[PDB]
Enzyme design. Structure first.
Site, mmCIF file in Angstrom:
data_model
loop_
_atom_site.group_PDB
_atom_site.id
_atom_site.type_symbol
_atom_site.label_atom_id
_atom_site.label_comp_id
_atom_site.label_asym_id
_atom_site.label_seq_id
_atom_site.Cartn_x
_atom_site.Cartn_y
_atom_site.Cartn_z
ATOM 1 N N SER A 49 1.898 -0.383 -5.254
ATOM 2 C CA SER A 49 0.952 -0.703 -4.195
ATOM 3 C C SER A 49 0.504 -2.152 -4.342
ATOM 4 O O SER A 49 0.574 -2.738 -5.427
ATOM 5 C CB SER A 49 -0.256 0.236 -4.236
ATOM 6 N N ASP A 98 -0.169 -3.599 15.061
ATOM 7 C CA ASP A 98 -0.776 -3.292 13.774
ATOM 8 C C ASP A 98 -2.079 -4.063 13.565
ATOM 9 O O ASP A 98 -3.140 -3.463 13.361
ATOM 10 C CB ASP A 98 0.298 -3.617 12.722
ATOM 11 N N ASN A 99 -2.017 -5.397 13.596
ATOM 12 C CA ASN A 99 -3.183 -6.188 13.203
ATOM 13 C C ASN A 99 -4.378 -5.880 14.092
ATOM 14 O O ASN A 99 -5.516 -5.836 13.619
ATOM 15 C CB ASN A 99 -2.883 -7.688 13.260
ATOM 16 N N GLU A 104 4.901 -8.815 5.079
ATOM 17 C CA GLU A 104 4.209 -7.973 6.049
ATOM 18 C C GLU A 104 3.069 -8.688 6.783
ATOM 19 O O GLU A 104 2.861 -8.449 7.980
ATOM 20 C CB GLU A 104 3.654 -6.735 5.325
ATOM 21 N N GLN A 134 10.180 -4.232 9.391
ATOM 22 C CA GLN A 134 10.549 -4.395 7.982
ATOM 23 C C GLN A 134 11.984 -3.954 7.723
ATOM 24 O O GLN A 134 12.746 -4.647 7.038
ATOM 25 C CB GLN A 134 9.607 -3.589 7.068
ATOM 26 N N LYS A 161 4.385 -6.136 15.528
ATOM 27 C CA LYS A 161 3.555 -6.109 14.327
ATOM 28 C C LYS A 161 2.192 -6.701 14.683
ATOM 29 O O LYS A 161 1.248 -5.949 14.949
ATOM 30 C CB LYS A 161 4.234 -6.874 13.179
ATOM 31 N N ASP A 182 3.582 -7.590 0.736
ATOM 32 C CA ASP A 182 2.418 -7.608 1.619
ATOM 33 C C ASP A 182 1.373 -8.477 0.931
ATOM 34 O O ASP A 182 0.751 -8.044 -0.042
ATOM 35 C CB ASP A 182 1.878 -6.208 1.866
ATOM 36 N N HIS A 219 0.801 -1.224 0.000
ATOM 37 C CA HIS A 219 0.000 0.000 0.000
ATOM 38 C C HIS A 219 0.835 1.276 0.000
ATOM 39 O O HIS A 219 1.599 1.525 0.941
ATOM 40 C CB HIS A 219 -0.926 0.001 1.220
ATOM 41 N N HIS A 261 -7.407 -9.572 4.016
ATOM 42 C CA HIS A 261 -6.471 -9.144 2.979
ATOM 43 C C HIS A 261 -7.098 -9.105 1.579
ATOM 44 O O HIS A 261 -6.779 -8.212 0.783
ATOM 45 C CB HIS A 261 -5.235 -10.036 2.972
ATOM 46 N N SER A 278 5.372 -1.976 12.709
ATOM 47 C CA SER A 278 5.462 -2.858 11.546
ATOM 48 C C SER A 278 6.653 -2.520 10.668
ATOM 49 O O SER A 278 7.395 -3.413 10.240
ATOM 50 C CB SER A 278 4.176 -2.760 10.717
ATOM 51 N N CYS A 315 -6.496 -1.840 13.269
ATOM 52 C CA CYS A 315 -7.885 -2.004 12.861
ATOM 53 C C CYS A 315 -8.824 -1.348 13.857
ATOM 54 O O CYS A 315 -9.865 -0.812 13.460
ATOM 55 C CB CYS A 315 -8.204 -3.487 12.692
ATOM 56 N N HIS A 340 -3.934 2.203 8.753
ATOM 57 C CA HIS A 340 -3.449 2.378 10.107
ATOM 58 C C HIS A 340 -2.739 3.726 10.244
ATOM 59 O O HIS A 340 -2.139 4.219 9.284
ATOM 60 C CB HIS A 340 -2.465 1.263 10.474
ATOM 61 N N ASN A 344 5.064 -10.261 10.062
ATOM 62 C CA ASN A 344 3.763 -10.214 10.727
ATOM 63 C C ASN A 344 3.855 -10.644 12.185
ATOM 64 O O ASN A 344 3.236 -10.036 13.064
ATOM 65 C CB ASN A 344 2.762 -11.107 9.991
ATOM 66 N N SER A 398 -5.671 1.291 -2.217
ATOM 67 C CA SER A 398 -5.060 1.713 -0.964
ATOM 68 C C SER A 398 -4.059 2.852 -1.113
ATOM 69 O O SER A 398 -3.652 3.422 -0.093
ATOM 70 C CB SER A 398 -4.374 0.532 -0.287
HETATM 71 N N1 LIG Z 1 -6.627 -4.431 6.745
HETATM 72 C C1 LIG Z 1 -5.587 -4.403 7.590
HETATM 73 O O1 LIG Z 1 -5.004 -3.349 7.883
HETATM 74 C C2 LIG Z 1 -4.980 -5.716 8.013
HETATM 75 C C3 LIG Z 1 -4.090 -5.761 9.086
HETATM 76 C C4 LIG Z 1 -3.499 -6.964 9.444
HETATM 77 C C5 LIG Z 1 -3.813 -8.107 8.742
HETATM 78 N N2 LIG Z 1 -4.717 -8.052 7.741
HETATM 79 C C6 LIG Z 1 -5.299 -9.276 7.130
HETATM 80 O O2 LIG Z 1 -6.448 -9.628 7.865
HETATM 81 C C7 LIG Z 1 -6.643 -11.058 7.810
HETATM 82 C C8 LIG Z 1 -6.751 -11.609 9.213
HETATM 83 O O3 LIG Z 1 -5.462 -11.450 9.847
HETATM 84 P P1 LIG Z 1 -5.197 -11.894 11.349
HETATM 85 O O4 LIG Z 1 -3.792 -11.532 11.644
HETATM 86 O O5 LIG Z 1 -6.275 -11.427 12.248
HETATM 87 O O6 LIG Z 1 -5.327 -13.479 11.217
HETATM 88 P P2 LIG Z 1 -5.711 -14.550 12.333
HETATM 89 O O7 LIG Z 1 -5.277 -15.897 11.910
HETATM 90 O O8 LIG Z 1 -5.094 -14.070 13.635
HETATM 91 O O9 LIG Z 1 -7.305 -14.455 12.518
HETATM 92 C C9 LIG Z 1 -8.226 -14.923 11.521
HETATM 93 C C10 LIG Z 1 -9.324 -15.603 12.290
HETATM 94 O O10 LIG Z 1 -10.404 -15.936 11.400
HETATM 95 C C11 LIG Z 1 -11.014 -17.098 11.904
HETATM 96 N N3 LIG Z 1 -11.837 -17.688 10.857
HETATM 97 C C12 LIG Z 1 -11.424 -18.372 9.743
HETATM 98 N N4 LIG Z 1 -12.404 -18.808 8.990
HETATM 99 C C13 LIG Z 1 -13.546 -18.386 9.658
HETATM 100 C C14 LIG Z 1 -14.914 -18.541 9.383
HETATM 101 N N5 LIG Z 1 -15.387 -19.229 8.343
HETATM 102 N N6 LIG Z 1 -15.793 -17.993 10.249
HETATM 103 C C15 LIG Z 1 -15.323 -17.340 11.314
HETATM 104 N N7 LIG Z 1 -14.054 -17.144 11.688
HETATM 105 C C16 LIG Z 1 -13.207 -17.694 10.808
HETATM 106 C C17 LIG Z 1 -9.852 -17.966 12.383
HETATM 107 O O11 LIG Z 1 -10.268 -18.893 13.375
HETATM 108 C C18 LIG Z 1 -8.906 -16.914 12.979
HETATM 109 O O12 LIG Z 1 -9.024 -16.834 14.395
HETATM 110 C C19 LIG Z 1 -5.485 -11.598 6.970
HETATM 111 O O13 LIG Z 1 -5.897 -11.696 5.612
HETATM 112 C C20 LIG Z 1 -4.411 -10.516 7.143
HETATM 113 O O14 LIG Z 1 -3.462 -10.539 6.079
HETATM 114 C C21 LIG Z 1 -5.296 -6.895 7.365
HETATM 115 K K LIG Z 2 -2.880 6.592 7.904
#
Ligand SMILES: NC(=O)c1ccc[n+]([C@@H]2O[C@H](COP(=O)([O-])OP(=O)(O)OC[C@H]3O[C@@H](n4cnc5c(N)ncnc54)[C@H](O)[C@@H]3O)[C@@H](O)[C@H]2O)c1
Ligand SMILES: [K+]
Ligand SMILES: NC(=O)c1ccc[n+]([C@@H]2O[C@H](COP(=O)([O-])OP(=O)(O)OC[C@H]3O[C@@H](n4cnc5c(N)ncnc54)[C@H](O)[C@@H]3O)[C@@H](O)[C@H]2O)c1
Ligand SMILES: NC(=O)c1ccc[n+]([C@@H]2O[C@H](COP(=O)([O-])OP(=O)(O)OC[C@H]3O[C@@H](n4cnc5c(N)ncnc54)[C@H](O)[C@@H]3O)[C@@H](O)[C@H]2O)c1
Ligand SMILES: NC(=O)c1ccc[n+]([C@@H]2O[C@H](COP(=O)([O-])OP(=O)(O)OC[C@H]3O[C@@H](n4cnc5c(N)ncnc54)[C@H](O)[C@@H]3O)[C@@H](O)[C@H]2O)c1
Ligand SMILES: Nc1ncnc2c1ncn2[C@@H]1O[C@H](CO)[C@@H](O)[C@H]1O
Ligand SMILES: [Cl-]
Ligand SMILES: [K+]
Ligand SMILES: [K+]
Ligand SMILES: [K+]
Lengths: 460, 461, 461, 461
Positions: free
Chosen positions: C76, C190-191, C156, C386, C186, C131, C53, C315, C382, C195, C374, C181, C81
């Site tokens: 990106s 971040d995660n 990432e 990196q 991180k 990423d 991004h 993602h 994060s 959010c 974020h 990650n 993004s």
């Molecule tokens: N948008 C953002 O800024 C941002 C930030 C960090 C990560 N991400 C992305 O977000 C996603 C989640 O990341 P994370 O670190 O929380 O992963 P994670 O593994 O910690 O959490 C995902 C959760 O989803 C649950 N899950 C899976 N299938 C499911 C279903 N059918 N019903 C209900 N729950 C279900 C799993 O049990 C798990 O606990 C990834 O794709 C990651 O790359 C996005």
């Molecule tokens: K920002």
């Protein structure tokens, strides 16, 4: 000194230790004690007092006495007395008739022991009440004593409702001060007091985890707002019932789902109108309304097995405990904690799973199963009580001519300036520092630098 | 054929119309009034001068007034609060509106005058809807002949009501007013929860600063200060609160805030020595909420932590001494309504200077200047009250009363509690809430009708 | 004349630089590395393919890598993004960047290709920063020869790591990787908290909906689900949580959420009869957080309450069956990245229809699509990781090792806990926080060094 | 004629039995194990020495072990944590238990020895269940021949695991152990949410102090410090957090706490001059959560605000230098486990002295000493792990392995994640929660079995 009745006088040293701590927690009340002790504004006052005989009431009582008053005291609930507080008061030579766990008959006898001294009516001239039981007894049974009484100071919402009704019907015989509706009472005690003491009471009675479970709070006035927060801050999923759409709106905006125990909100008296799916998910119901039968027999039949049932409104008839006494077997777990077995009246399986847990037999649960509001909150309520006692005693209503009496016969609140002066001592007790308006700012918003800072219409 | 408007860009009308259609679905109380009263046209003959933020939410209010029979001429009550797509959709609907985001003060005045005048002469206005009282004062000072035929003023906000009450006390208020602010479904909804929603919103849009873990100071703890403090605390800020009112300060303490003053022992002696420099040197964000003047003053601004954000959510920008900062410090626009104010001097600055403050909306109320103000579902309550207040004053026909009858109705009043409750009921149903109906026995036990009102007028909620 | 870039509008460069200067002051861990390593030039000779991004926060990352000696070519990793002022500022600094907000999918693939190729021939890259794994897979499937000169990948995000671990398990991974990650600064910063900050931010920017008092369903309760649920609960939503992992579901219960499934008894039999229609018919907002496929499926979307908001912060957009909605329902654009999806059918919508859903960012990660992702102070953690991971793999020089040495170093590893703590320390100092120093007696008593690491590798925080 | 026990008052048994019957309905994972394994009797022949807080919750654990076939001999692991009605009910069921609230240190040791010896000689123990390691240490130092026939230790708490791992690294651990603490359904349930529930509970029971609006300092921010900080913040306290671990400190910042140290710049220079007297002079409540030594030391106690409350919720009372206070200051008992400590001198006090501290449970872990510890529904997770861990080690029969086979299995290990998830699932179902089942396509997509486990062993939740 023998003019008292308490559970155990040997608890006095303990009560005194807790009174000394409470004094440090009650700067508004102790501030009044120090400001007025030399003036003795309550010299000659003879106060009939009826309110929960707690440590906090002990500090109130000793403040009134320190300002010159004689008192005779009883508790206003059968389960709210703290026996160590009652003992310390008795030990200090103050007539008190109160113990935790009174029967109804003993409750009435205690009130009568304050009204009568050595077999004859005391020459009382002031009344301090919580909920109006003493007020009504004086009006119904001892009207001659009211001829010598200068006023009533009433603590709580239910008591004020009963005072206003008597005034509306021309039956109130002495003026009263509505202590409940000081902001440093209603928006402090009624709300934050219950925030502190409701989850406290539930934990002491049951030791139940609250996080993750479902609660239904009936009512969202000041008590219902504080009660809902008590539960939500523990992680409960709280739903709220209300008849008042404005209070329901506040519940929505505070993040609660607003529901009725009855389909479409309409209680047609039949079981068919109960929302059984909703009540079947509720682990905890709390009544906060000051109304009657808001947790009724059909709701109790539909509640989830092993749900906790309690009331923090003033009177136990918010819940239909009479129905439960008539139909269901009561198992005492420990004092003020009963399992109510929905399987029958004349026995229960010790391992039965279809029961409810009732706290304090439906009496106000924060006082019945814990210690009520904490000292630093009751500081506000009771500083108001002392000011209200001083105000009405100084006015000397009973000594006025008939025409003067008609002009003073009212139910009034304390002036906002005194409300603010109580609040300021509470703020300083937290170490808070209030800003002083500059003269230019005071002119700009139209107030005195000293206050009052808000119009009487302000709701805070 | 319609040209009687001035907006930033009329081509934004289609977007504004899309957002108005969405807002209608978020405003059940206002759209309930539209359905209930459309047939009877209670505002037929009403000609309303309106001056309040030209947002999407005000657009739904405007079109409700018109749907009930009124004609209007509208302007915004703040130079930064207009949403240009809202103004465009209103102008496209044939409604005279004079408003754009980023007016100068001279254009602000001209826009109000364009509502007052039509084809160069006084409009035949007979109602006024106002926020903060600028329109109300111009009419009293400059257009008293117009007030002769105006039946009432409905005033949205705390500062406007203060100004109305001062005119009534001095005998200079010429028409009756409804204090819309002090409906519970306004003051205890809009003023509090609206700022809860929109303060952190505006700060994020203007700066994109993480708020969690940082130190804030909120000046004031009335309804706006309460909502503002929650807006920040719910994000994880460490929030301290300042107050001159010990009762509000008591609430801040009980709500879990430390109550502090910018001045040592709360006494502003006018000198830098009275400033609590240690306290202010830790603050990352200061928010003024008072409706008062100079509550974030020059000496406080000098003492604030480097790179702190300064903003106001009260009605007028003079809560902050921005004039001091214009006279002494170098302003660098980051983007519209976001300035870095370099405390290193008036004339120029180093682009990498670390000694600056960030001012949002040039001190103007920040939720409207840097975001979109309160959300539709909250403004639903405020504006349903506005519509009810316009109907109430218009039906009373004060301008047509004889002198002796005018005298008995010249006042500043709130709407009846029954109406307040009926607004809240529609709000509650909008959430899917289900209010319980009292039984006859319960209604008798607490001494109310089953229909309400449920509380005495002294009740504070 | 520098022309090796493609951005939306180069004239946004000055605005982007102003925001970069601000973000530097919000990223003390990243700028600490920039100051500590500038003289050593640890990335001298590095040629980094970066795909993440193109935000202001990524801008500070890019300029840190360059300050430490690297050359880069950047795109990106998502079509929505990019922040155009950030991309312009980087392009204005003479850095090759190919990114703009609102790319088509073809433009997205073309941008990644412009980083890979310089003057029509494969660039002499030796490092990768990714990423989500798209660039990583393109290199493996399309440019395998380029991987012979690459020393490592620093990845990432959770989904990208999942893809790397699968390639390692199948023996298809050609260069070593660092799992950025799963640094605690991180994943648990971040995660989760990112959010928390940016989910309600994006929803407010897209819709300006009040959230208080409305019903939300969060699918998933991992790090993103936890932060998302708090983003909504702290605004006053009534939040229900769905999970397939009972441990995560247990955490949701303890955190005060009701745990529910869209399907009766949690069993999706593929039929509409398995949908819990009563539950979904009350949901005003659904947010997918899983990194899994089709967790908000067609039958769920058919059953949602009218006018519910639908969005994804995982993602990839395939968390939601938007293909079903494109095929069967009529899309009305409200504004960029905000669409009403009319469930009345294909082939036309009524502008006043009430039976629609609101879809944010066309199902792409909503915090970056409808807001700015974020905040800088969170991305600090994060992106310091990196920078440390790039330094680590570049110094190891995998591409130069003999085959037996490469075999021993081909892995997917996390950074050492000591570095994780050192990043956190700088973050804590950014808040003004003051850690206590263990005495030697206390360090001995718990079996650690005064310097740390303070926890065993098994510790979960 | 059962006499092999010592409790405060056997007539409390009926009350204890009533609370056990309630607690069984609050402990569905433990009662699920009872039902699943009763027929199999997996603990037939097991003879368990148990040393853990003799609470109602431990009573349900004991009766589950017995129901699965075990014999036990039990004591409490803390002098103040026994609930006397719980102990009486266990003794009334014919189970050897030696425990009462308010033991002396000498009685504490005698109680442990009463479990080890039966009729004056070593009991034929073959399993150990311990909390904090006192029993484990006694067996290693004083009864090594008994360890020859013991198959394993299951250890409940962080501090006990630390002691096990030190013995393992020194070659002195004689039997394998299960780290029960580090199941997620223990550490991230009991350690965190248990203290969230029971810390404010114990403080209210001991002092009945209002907490809202007051100032707290929580020393430590691991699992216990996280739950404790929330316990106080949710009540409205203004909470500050101290930490030596910068990663945990970062979490405290992000969670919205100010991170401070009792020492200037976090550095103890061995004198009072390094105490931040201004900070401590504002603190109304200090809570130690570290498992470390002297983290609330003599000079901190000297600097605390008058009338501050001092308590510890870590495992051992030496987190606070109570030895200094016994030596120098006068103790006044308010009521059991509540003392005022008068800083005016050692020899007597004025009853109205204002210069005192309030110490809870004499510095012993306060949730158990002044309230009832964690609630049943939280201890459900911990104690379900305990039962599974006893089964696992008992079935392995380490004592019966030849020396060379013992060597391959002598370790401190956690239960497999699959069992951790199965415990959590029963906890979730206890709340009425409904987990979703993965479809086969979804399970393949994330690379797990539809049965789980759902996360890799590196996952931190
Ligand atoms: N948008 C953002 O800024 C941002 C930030 C960090 C990560 N991400 C992305 O977000 C996603 C989640 O990341 P994370 O670190 O929380 O992963 P994670 O593994 O910690 O959490 C995902 C959760 O989803 C649950 N899950 C899976 N299938 C499911 C279903 N059918 N019903 C209900 N729950 C279900 C799993 O049990 C798990 O606990 C990834 O794709 C990651 O790359 C996005
Ligand atoms: K920002
Ligand atoms: N236990 C305590 O320490 C304590 C403290 C303060 C007051 N009180 C008592 O608590 C009671 C409530 O006091 P309050 O000050 O909150 O009063 P309140 O008038 O502010 O609130 C009571 C609420 O109950 C609602 N209500 C009435 N009937 C209802 C019904 N059938 N269903 C749902 N909601 C219903 C009303 O609409 C109202 O909002 C009074 O009896 C008061 O004396 C107790
Ligand atoms: N931006 C918005 O959307 C919005 C919404 C509602 C109202 N308003 C405006 O916000 C302002 C506040 O409105 P309100 O309804 O909260 O009013 P309010 O009277 O309820 O509260 C203002 C508070 O400021 C306090 N105060 C005054 N001078 C102070 C000082 N020097 N230091 C500290 N505290 C001080 C007062 O004690 C008072 O409690 C008004 O100007 C109102 O018009 C704005
Ligand atoms: N009372 C209860 O019911 C209960 C429950 C669970 C565990 N425990 C006990 O509580 C203690 C803490 O357990 P935990 O699981 O939270 O351990 P933990 O390792 O997760 O957390 C302890 C924290 O203390 C911090 N710390 C150490 N020295 C410090 C210092 N001088 N200043 C500030 N912070 C410092 C460490 O950095 C660490 O984060 C242990 O003794 C454990 O046995 C008690
Ligand atoms: N009610 C309780 N019964 C038994 N053990 C408990 C209780 N509350 C907390 N504990 C345990 O006490 C340990 C600390 O000695 C913690 O590991 C925790 O699991
Ligand atoms: Cl040392
Ligand atoms: K109390
Ligand atoms: K808006
Ligand atoms: K317990």
């Amino acid at each position: 000194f023998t003019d008292y009745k308490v559970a155990d006088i040997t608890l006095a040293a303990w009560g005194r230790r807790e009174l000394i701590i409470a004094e440090s927690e009650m700067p508004a009340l102790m501030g009044l004690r120090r400001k007025y002790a030399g003036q003795q504004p309550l010299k000659g006052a003879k106060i009939l007092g009826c309110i929960h005989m707690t440590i906090q009431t002990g500090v109130l009582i000793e403040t009134l006495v320190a300002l010159g008053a004689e008192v005779r005291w009883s508790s206003c609930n059968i389960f709210s007395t703290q026996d160590q507080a009652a003992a310390a008061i008795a030990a200090a030579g103050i007539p008190v008739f109160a113990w935790k766990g009174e029967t109804e008959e003993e409750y009435e006898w205690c009130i009568e022991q304050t009204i009568l001294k050595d077999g004859q009516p005391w020459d009382a001239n002031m009344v301090l009440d919580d909920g109006g039981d003493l007020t009504e007894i004086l009006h119904k049974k001892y009207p001659q004593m009211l001829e010598r009484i200068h006023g009533i100071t009433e603590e709580t919402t239910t008591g004020v409702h009963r005072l206003l009704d008597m005034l509306k019907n021309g039956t109130l015989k002495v003026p009263a001060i509505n202590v409940n509706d000081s902001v440093t009472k209603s928006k402090n005690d009624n709300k934050y007091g219950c925030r502190h003491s409701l989850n406290d009471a539930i934990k002491r009675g049951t030791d139940h985890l609250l996080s993750g479970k479902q609660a239904l709070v009936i009512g969202y006035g000041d008590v219902g707002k504080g009660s809902s927060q008590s539960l939500r801050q523990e992680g409960m999923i709280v739903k709220v019932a209300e008849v008042d759409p404005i209070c329901a709106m506040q519940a929505c905006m505070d993040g609660f789902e607003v529901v009725s125990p009855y389909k479409n909100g309409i209680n047609d008296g039949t079981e068919a109108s109960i929302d059984a799916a909703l009540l079947g998910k509720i682990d905890l119901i709390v009544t906060t309304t000051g109304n009657v039968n808001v947790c009724d027999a059909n709701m109790l039949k539909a509640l989830k097995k092993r749900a906790v049932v309690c009331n923090i409104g003033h009177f136990d008839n918010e819940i239909d405990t009479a129905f439960m006494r008539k139909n269901w077997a009561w198992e005492e777990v420990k004092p003020q904690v009963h399992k109510i077995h929905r399987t029958g009246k004349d026995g229960f399986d010790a391992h039965n799973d279809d029961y409810l847990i009732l706290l304090a037999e439906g009496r106000l649960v924060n006082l019945g199963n814990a210690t009520g509001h904490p000292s630093r909150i009751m500081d506000g309520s009771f500083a108001n009580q002392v000011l209200a006692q001083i105000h009405l005693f100084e006015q000397k209503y009973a000594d006025l001519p008939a025409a003067e009496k008609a002009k003073r016969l009212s139910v009034e609140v304390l002036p906002k300036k005194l409300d603010e002066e109580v609040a300021l001592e509470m703020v300083k007790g937290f170490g808070g520092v209030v800003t002083q308006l500059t003269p230019k700012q005071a002119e700009y918003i139209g107030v005195s630098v000293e206050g009052p800072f808000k119009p009487d219409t302000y709701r805070y």
